[model samples]
Target: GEEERFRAYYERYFAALAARDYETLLEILREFGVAKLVLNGREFASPEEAVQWARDTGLRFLRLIRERYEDGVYTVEDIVSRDDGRYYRHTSTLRRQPDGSYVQYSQLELLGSG
Candidate 1:
């Protein structure tokens, strides 16, 4: 039950992301926490940087493939460096949104994805 709901929400969120719908993504993600933490957790210096990173990375990927998926659960094997020598190929697993997206989870930054 928990995993299924998480998958659905994330699938929807990813769809919005692929659509370049940051506003919607924000709505979904914001319900969980503030922009500062989200950006920081994603290894971004600020919201602006986070948005830019998403646009440059995820948006760019969507532009070519036109679609993407979570591929749920993995180790460093899933990620690889992509950003200008600063970022790595990070992955995310959908989480449960019990109180309307207000769920707690640990924040992890990308280090080395082997």
Candidate 2:
């Protein structure tokens, strides 16, 4: 059903992020028509810009939860520890479009330590 589909998409999203596979992530975002990215209060105009931000930040963290699923909205909450041992809590929310695609319309980050 819709839950399974959402779950699949969620898993694929994080998997791509963890692998640092920008190509795959781009493909997924394009297919979903994802056009907006709000990172820590700043907005991006394109998926490429958002992907670049990820690369710049250094994708070096793990997901804390095993499953995330939602029919119309999805949220991500996880802890990320940078190479320099700085920890932070990552959070983002995505809304489903009427056309069946999705948009990550908002995101924020909170800093922490080990």
Candidate 3:
């Protein structure tokens, strides 16, 4: 059951992510109860603001690896490399919904390197 749910959500999340679909992204965020998003020390007050920042700064999720799920939460660490050769590790937290679905709740910047 968990596998199926994660499969569906992961597909939807990355599809919208690759397309830069802000509208769908906002809906997903709401589904996850995401009220704020912070990236690289810059915080977004709203999903719209985050979407705009993504658009303006060419923000993209390069890849998601080293994911593990436990206690109704999924955590994954990923890397975001700048065009200038800088890279950072981002850790995202997703909570499993009451209905067995999963939604992203919080993300934190763990570390960075060049």
Ranking by TM-score: 2, 3, 1
lDDT of 3: 0.62
Candidate 3: lDDT of 51?
A: 65
Per model, how many backbone clashes are there? 0, 0, 0
Task: Show model 2 residue runs off by greater than 4 Å.
Answer: 66-70, 81-85, 99-101
Write candidate 2's Cα lDDT for 1-114 as tens digits: 767766676678778777777677778887766877876678787899877766776765576544355767777676665556666677767777788656685433557656
Q: Write one digit per residue (lDDT tens) for candidate 1, span 8-87.
A: 65566657765677667666665534234243244444345555655575442222112233333211112223334443
Kindly report which residue stretches of model 1 are placed more than 4 angstroms away from their true locations once superposed: 32-58, 61-88, 93-114
Choose 1 or 2, whichever is better by lDDT: 2
All candidates: TM-score: 0.42, 0.75, 0.59
TM-score of 3: 0.59
lDDT of each: 0.43, 0.69, 0.62
Error of 2 at 11 (Å): 1.6
- RMSD to true structure for each model, in Å: 7.6, 2.6, 4.3
What range of 10 consecutive residues in model 2 has the weakest lDDT sum? Answer: 60-69
